[model samples]
Structures are given as structure tokens and as C-alpha cells.
Target chain A: QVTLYGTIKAGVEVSRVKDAGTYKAQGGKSKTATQIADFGSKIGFKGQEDLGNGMKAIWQLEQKASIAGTNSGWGNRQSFIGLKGGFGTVRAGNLNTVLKDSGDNVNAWESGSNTEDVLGLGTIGRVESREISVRYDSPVFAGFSGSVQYVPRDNANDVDKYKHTKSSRESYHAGLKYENAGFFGQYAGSFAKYADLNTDAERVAVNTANAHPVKDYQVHRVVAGYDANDLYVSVAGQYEAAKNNEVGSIKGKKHEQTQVAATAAYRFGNVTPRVSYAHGFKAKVNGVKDANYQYDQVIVGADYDFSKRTSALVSAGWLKQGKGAGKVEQTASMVGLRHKF
Target chain B: QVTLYGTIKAGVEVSRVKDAGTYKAQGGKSKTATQIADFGSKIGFKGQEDLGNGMKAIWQLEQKASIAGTNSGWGNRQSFIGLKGGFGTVRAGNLNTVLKDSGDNVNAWESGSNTEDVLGLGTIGRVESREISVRYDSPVFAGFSGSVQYVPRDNANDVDKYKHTKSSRESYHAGLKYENAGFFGQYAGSFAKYADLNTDAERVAVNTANAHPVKDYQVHRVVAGYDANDLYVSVAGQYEAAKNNEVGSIKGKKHEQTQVAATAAYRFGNVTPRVSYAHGFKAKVNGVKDANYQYDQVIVGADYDFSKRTSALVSAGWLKQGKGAGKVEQTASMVGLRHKF
Candidate 1:
């Protein structure tokens, strides 16, 4: 049997972003816009066929939907075909990295325009992404489980022997989790070869003539959370590093940073209120501290459940970046409805 | 209530196209390639809510999916929101023109790689298209029904007062049908302003110096068919005309042509065999006949039904264009499977 499932979330919001004194000196301006927003809306089809003896074949096709009149492409989300058994499950095709799944424990804000993502602060390195890859998940053993994913090449161009070194575009992710009672804990890591080194700090610190074409990028994250008695809390810490990969005659450069975030929420009847805060420390290049490479964000929201599959949410957020990090500041507020079927 | 429906079709084919003497003289080459093909696979979500008193609200979101691995965008197919009542139905959004729906009664060939489309033969003006528009479909009255669709503007560019005249990008399509017993007849017409005038014949006959920015295009088609007693047959005739719309000082160029097509099929148990032929007459430029502006095609196919919603198809086709019409020839053969859920 096949099943159809999806979430449709739409909202209206007023948002603004402005450049601080340091950024305005370099010709940046403030802007404000108001419109309807689509918050991670999606539609998916999935099915499983039993093959007997504790085994089965599973498949899914999913795509993003933009209720705000924009367009998205097919396979824009996790889509794959795989098999499952006592030995665990394996899947291939466009898949989300294990690091991405780890964020579920900390994602308490409404999505899209109202999102307050700890893993994606302005100056912090993003630790989550989807890629064409093969993945494996181990069955739970004593409330413990793990997953690993690997991508042989990021794209066809990486296959050209004359243009790229062996495994220059490869990537991998791994994650482990334990859950029991009302407590949860997770550790996840991701690594990529030939990743872009174009952060605001990098551009400010390195001269154009000294830049390399690609970099070796790595990220590690740890999360701990509790959900019980109508109360939820999560705390996460992450570390990111990038080193320029030698190419031709260009010498390599390196940078590293750390970030931390926490969220707390409590439910009273059908309403739940939540708040979160995240901060990124300044990055260090070649063992030296870099200026304006830090950021901070805060978000507050409440969700009112009308039914098991429907809810209304109102959220507001504020984000600010350090002087050297483009000195950017943003604020947004929105009210939205979400329904799942 | 919401329903999810879709079709998945994939095939493998060997196809080649070659240019005849006239085309080769102008730098055309023969090329052959073999690959897997996606045959109009799609997934859709639809729902209806009763509004009482014989009225209901309806909406659908549909997008093409490539089973062969290519990606398609959301809302790439027909998608609309509308309401229905005792009087009729009205919808607004990206929609298929009324003329496109008229082909359903005559479309007997497998789609995509094995298609034998009478309405889309080489050198014959195409009559089907989807556009952002508002459409109204009348309720059936004594086996008679009709539809009308209107597009205010083709794109945002047409809204600029300095760049285009009022209604320069407007279009409309209307179709009427009568069905009773085993006989069916349909009439469809389409008209567009400021349409592209870039056909092979047009490019060859009109000088660049005298070319206008756009053209007024129109098409009229009539189809008659009988589908009953395990036998199906259809015959259709179409007339098309395009005249350059005056822009600046460029003189308007005019071209007109006619095309006809026929198909016949008979079912034998679970197997059905079919054949179709189409011809396009030479076109007249201004007042004189243009050379090499005609084409002809022949297709033969058979389908085996494994179940009501599953089938296997095999087909072959040959097409030839007139010397002045690029003098191109194409041949293709394919085997495919289609399943719907």
C-alpha cells in the first residue's frame, strides 16, 4: 500500500534587515518587506512492500511546495529507495545527512520567515545539507542507534580526472543518538572535500590573489534535551573548521569557530510557549583571532493546537552580526497556520 | 477530504533524426542516441469541501515527476483553486487551455517517447498550451458542454506601459463538445496577441530587416470520433494563421496553413493495436505558397493491459518534413510500462 502525506503552512509577515555602521560604510542599506510566506511546506509519497522473513523494500518521493506562489523542484527534499531487515536499513538517492536529522531535537521555532536556526546563524557554519548519497541506519539496541552517509562525488564535474584530484568532491556524515525516559542525547559530524571557502571573514582576511579554489570543511555537533511533564528543553554545542586545499601554486589557509544554543518550552493546556538563543564565538584564522566573525540570535514563539493535525503559530526573532561579519541586523514577526494530512 | 493520485511511466528507446539534402546544405546532421525516458509521469494532490446547497470548493496541486531521474518544478502542470455549484465551475491559476482538453477524446497513443501526437506534428502549428489564466467550464446540458479560458497577460513584462501596448500579451481559448452514445465531436479555437513568429518557414521567408517584434497567432480545430464496441477511430482537421503584429515601422508578415490527421484502433482481448497518420499542407506566405513548408508522419503501436491501471506499450514512428521546412526526418522505437495509483 502507498501513503500520501504532506504539510501546508502559510503565513503573513513583516521583516527587515539593516546594515550596521561598519557595513553601511561599505555601501549597505536597510530594507523591509511584507508578504505571505511558505514555511517548509511539502508533499510526499511513500510505500513499503514486504519481502517476507523480517525484510521489506521501502521507497519515497518528496518535493517542496511554495504556497506563496513561488516554485520549487522535484526531489528538492529527501527522496530514496531502500531495504530493511534485522541487520538494519540501507538507502540510496538524494538523502539528508545525519547531522541534519540531529537538529530535530532543537528545532522549536516556526519555519521559514520565522525560523531561528542555531545551525545557520549568519556567521556560523551550516552543518546540515542534502546530497546524493547512500546511507545506513542501525536498529536501536538498548535505546541507542546510529547512522552514516557517504557521497562519492558532489556532481559530474568532479568526475573529470584532468580537473580534479581523487575524492576531491566527496563528503560524509555520521550521527549517534540515545533516547530513554524523557531524556535525549545526540552527537553528529560532517566533512566535505573541495568545499567553498567564501565566508565574509575569509573575504576580509585573505587577499583575492591568495585564495584557493576549494577547502576541506568539517563540523561537529552535540545535543542534549528533555521532554516530559509538558515541558521541553534542549542545549546544543557545535564546532566548525575549514582549511584551504592546495591547488596549483596557492598556499592553504585555515579557520575555526565555536557556537552554542539553547531552547526552553512549556505547554499549558493546548498552548505552548517557547524561547531560544544562540551565540557564535569569533573565528580564528591561522591561529589568530578575526574581527566581526561572531553573531547572536533570539526567538520567541507560541503554538496553539486546534487538533492533532492542525495548529496556529505566532513568532518573532532578532538577529545581529559582529562588525567584521557584515554588521547585519534582522528582525521579523509572523502568524501562521499549519495543517498535516 | 483529500486524495493523492499519480502515474509513473518509464521507457527505453533508440531514436535518431537526420536532415535531408536541403537541410544538410544548411548545416544539419544525423544524430542517434539511446537512453531511458520519462513519459509524462506526475503526482497530484486534490481536495473538495462542501459549501452546502449543491456548492463546493475545490483545489488541486500537480507537478511532473521524472522517473528517469530528471527534475521538474512544482506546479509545472495544471494546478488551480476553484468552486463548483449548480450553475457551473470557475477556476483561477496556472491552467490548461480549453483547446488542450479537447484532445482527450482522440489521444490513443502512449505518451512521451512513444507519442504520435496529431496536434504537434512537424510544420503543423501547435494548438495546446498551459497558461496562468481564469477559466469557466459549463455544466453538461443534454450531452453538450463548453469551456472558456482567458489570460490577462502572459508575464510581468507585458505589464510595463513603456515596453508593451495594453493587452499586447492577452490570450483566449474556447472549446465546445457534444457526446452521445459512441460518437463524439469537438471544436476548439485559440488566439494570442504578441506571440513569437519564429517558425522555420517564417524565418526563411521573412527578412530580418522587415521582421516585427511579435505576431498575432490563431488556430481552429475540429475533431470527430467513434469509440465503442472495442473499436476506436478519430479524424481531425486544423487551420492555423499567424501575422506579424505591427511594431515600430516593421511591416506585418502573414502565413496560413492547414493540417489533417486520422487514427484507428481495435481491441482484441487484452491487446490493442493502433495506427495513425498526419499531414500538413504547404503554407502560404502573404499570398504565395512557401516551398518546403509541409510534413507527414506515420505511427504504429500496440498496448497490452495487465490490469485496469497497469499496461505495457510498444511503438514505432517515422516523420518527414518538406525540403523548405528544414527537410528533417526522424525515426524512433520504444517499449515502456505505465502504472497509475
Candidate 2:
């Protein structure tokens, strides 16, 4: 058996924006990239034990608490336990789905989180955390593999961890993994409903059917990365659908999109330059309009590897928002050195 | 070398006090739980690699975020890395000081976030999460030696890792550990201040501290445990101080608890039973008088080791709470079974 340990982190950032009222009011506005440790910090514990035969057991009870400031300290986060071997792995706890892997593929870094994560299930200015979950991962079969994951909140008011499945407020996710020759592929999908959520009296999230209605959402994304000796290339596209509140739409809106993304790079010695882009359409989930939401994004960057443990990176990006969707745009730049010992 | 991984968690919990109306509005009362994910729940990544010499360089970067619902995530917890080994192992990164250990010793479990933790630097009911720490653990320095640790959260707005001393706020902590012939002892302390935290808040915390303070607070505690043959015993104490804005008192409201607790029990084969106690004194922070802050605890528990990988536990406890001091003075019990593989 081996023991695993982890710690927490807190960094501050500051930024400026033309429109920041709502995000700020919600306490999540990344308005000005200001370094505020309001995110709290944490530490964790997890481990694995080789039971016997070809079998092994893995369990983790991670505690994500704040250490940065006087934020609510020592709460609870990702935790689970299960067994795995040749067949497959079954785990029950506060877990993450393959959806995260897909979302992460588009995130800036492995990440600290910002407004870049809002399209998913639980997002605050694009940032998301955890949901009570039970997940399963299948063994790789040939060059193709797949996974199924879910978070069933079990409509409980007393506590959440004790239950994993129940209410219509559930999230189901699936993804396939494949690689052969110079091509690779990952197809991910998800559907959800927050039927149990209640809106606020201020017409916030409580009674607004269109706001907290038991909406069902789905995401279909395809990603591929190809490599040939010193050169490598990859790309991904995702289509998302969120149920519309009948109270506010023609029927159920189809938030559809046709996204085409691509990235290519050639390693010249130690430097690799790459660029990528993705565009999304509002696709009206409430069947409101043929066009209401249109967002476009592009990330361009380069990295220089000094060795196996050290590297330097620089990046810049642009985003465009549509309609009443907070007419906004952004251009960002960052440079830093990272190393592992 | 090992790798580091984790998430960021930040959520706002809104609650209405049944009787808090007179303190704020005429007919409405509200309470907010902020940055509750500190050490709450999160994905963790960690690694360790030898740097050659008996002295190895160990490090980590842990982030905390929300995955439960809609919340913007941040990396404001203990997330950093450093090296340790002989020469008493000197290390740097975001970490817990001896103060955290002391706080844990004071509570059987963390409070439900609002008035639960009740013993740490975190939201009154929680402990602090991240801090730029420098720790040194003596190589056991024989059975007579110990270790020293500190975290200087240089400020609260900086990027040295969100610490009281590193996050643009200012705070410091230190601790010592020692053990000899089945007996162990420890003493630790912590102090912190937010940049915007003012004397008024401090004075306020001393008056109506029980209602919860938004700024200017501090905590200190100590603990000791012992083991001889198959029996074990331990005791701990804590003193918390903060400013009050409501009680209108000008002193720092404080609650000081001295817990003299010891556990005694012997395992008959797979069965073991035990019992323990703690006491609290009224101090001032926000000026509420914090009535009946004293606490008494009695625990009766039994455990059966089913195997090296599993076990069963039956525990029941009675905790006495003195009014405003905070806690559930009720009959609580638990019967559970656990297996590792």
C-alpha cells in the first residue's frame, strides 16, 4: 500500500473590464484580475493498496479547505473509494466526470479557474467545483476505450454525501478514448437537470422557471491529437444543448453550435509554437430566437522546453460576445517559467 | 520527484436567522457562509522524487474549487512546494502551521460551516487554509527533540501563495513537537490580520463575536497525547479572539477553552472502548458575553478490526454546550462498518 498527500494553493490576479456589475455582485466576477485569496485553499489525503491476486483497492477522502484567509476552513470535496483490476473500476464519492477532461482541454492552463467555465453544469463566472457522484471507468479495449460517469444528487435536504442517486437533478456523462497510427479521438457527452433547485425571491434563481427549471443539457465534443516524431497536431469540436424552460420559450430551445477547432506544431529544437480557435452559437435553448448568443474564441501560444523538468511559456487570446450576451471582448497575455524537481 | 494537483472551491451559503432580525433589518435576517470550501472537497495531485542526498526536495501545488453547483473557483488554499531532509529539513510552500493541529484537537468534527468550526482562524467554525510556510522537522532528534514550523502570510494581495503574510494580509505561526517513551507533547500558536481589517472590527469582534465577525480575528491552541501498551490518552486547548461589530463593545471578543481530556481503553481481541472532555471560558471579541461558552464531552466507543483492511465501529457521545458558546448539546450516536479492499 502507498500513501498519497496533497496541499492547497492561493494566488491573486487582477484585471479590468468594461462590464463587471453582475459578476462582481455574484462575488465571482473576475472583473479586474485582482489577486484575492477569497477562493480559500486546501490539503488532501488519498491512497492505494494492492489487495492481492491481480486486484487492488483505491480510496480517497480529500479535504479541500481554506488556508489562505479566514474563509470557511476545512470543508469537504472530492472523496471516493473503490476497487479495480482487469475488469474495470467502480468508485463512489464526490467525483468528477469525463466532462471535466473535455472542458479542461479548452481551459488555459491545467488551471486556477476564471469565467472560462460557465457553460457546464455548475458554473460561477465560468468556474465550477464538485457534485456528489458515482463513477465508473472501463478497461482499455484494443485501441478504443470508453467511460461512463454520473452525479445523482438523490434529492436529500439533510446531507448530500450519503446519497448519490435520486432526483431528476442528475448528471450523466460518457466519453470514448481512441488512438491508432497518427490520429487520436475522444468523444464526450453529458445531460443534466436541476429540478430541485429553487429560485430567489428577487426573481433570482427560485421561481424563475427559465432560471432554475429542471432543464436537461447535453454536450457532444470530439477531440483528436496527432503526433509524428518531432511534429504534433490536434483539434476538437463540441456541440452543447441545454433544456429550455417552457415557461419562457416556444418549447425546449436547442442551444446548438458548429464548432471547428485545430492546433498544429513543429518542434524546432526545443521551441513549439501553436495556435487554436473555437466559436459557439447560442442555438436558443428556449426557442427564443434564431440568433441571440454568439461567442468566438482564439488561443495562440508558444512554449520552450529547457529540459525534462523546466520550461517557459507565453500566450495571448481574444474573445467576442454576441447580442445582449454582455457585449464583450478580451485580449490576454501571460508569460511564466515552470519547473519540476 | 512527485507531482502536485488539486482544485479551488468557493461557495456562498445564504441563511436567514429565525431571530436575527433585530440585529439587522426589521423583518429579515440573513447569514452568509463564505469561502466555505477551504480544505473542503477537491481533486488532489501530489508526487515525491529523491534529490539524492538524504535530504530530498519535496513539493506540491494544491488548488481548491467548487464543483457542486455554480461557483467561480480559485486557488486560494495551501498550494506550494519545497525541500526537506536532514539538517532538520527546511521547506517552503503553502501549508498548515502547528495552530491547525491544535484547532483540530479542540473539536470532534468541524461545525456545519457557520458556527460549527468554532475553534479555528476560519469563519469562526473553521480553520485557516493556505499560508506560505517554512517548516523544519528534526530527524526525531532522539526521543527528546521536536520540530518547528511557521507561515508568514506576508500579505493578502501578493502571489507568494495566499497567506496572511503572503496574501496582502499579515500573520505568523510557530509550533514545537516532542515525544519520548510513549508520551508526546505539543504547543503551537497563530496570529493574523487582514489588510483592511481595522481596530473597529477588532473591537467589535470582542463585543458581539458570537454573531460572526467579518474581520480582525486571531486564535491559539495546544495539544498533547499519550500511548502506553494498548491504551491511549490526549488533551487539547484553544483561545480565539476577534473584533465585534454588533455587540458594540470596544474590546476584542474572545472565547478561551481549556480542554483537559484523556482517552482510556483496552482492546479485547477486535473490540475496544473509550471516553474524553473539554471546557471553555468566555472572553470577548464582539461583546456578546458569549454566555455558557463552556463545554463537556463524554464519548463511548467500540471498534472491531475485521481485518487489516477493514473494521467496524460503534460510537456514541454526549456533548454539553453552554448557550451562545455554540454547538449541539444533544444525544448523538453512530454505528458503522468500513473495509479497505
For residue B134, model 2's alpha carbon misses the true position, in angstroms, by: 14
Q: Write the per-residue lDDT of candidate 2 for residues A54-142, one digit (tens) a residue.
A: 77898876654433323332326677888888878988777665766665444433113332322111121121235556778888788
Cα RMSD to native, each candidate? 9.2, 13.2
DockQ for all models? 0.08, 0.06
Best by lDDT: 1
How does chain A of candidate 1 score by TM-score against the true chain A?
0.87
Best by DockQ: 1
List iRMS (one decimal) for every candidate. Answer: 7.5, 9.3
List model 1's recovered fraction of native interface contacts, to 2 decimals: 0.11
lDDT of 1 by residue, A1-341 (tens): 68987776655555656675523433454444443445666788899999989999999988887543357766778999999999999999889889778777656555553333421232332556677789999999999999999977534134454655444556779999999999999999887765555555232112245444446778889999998999999998988887755564334767788888888999999899988888888888655776466778888889987656667788888887776535777777877766676
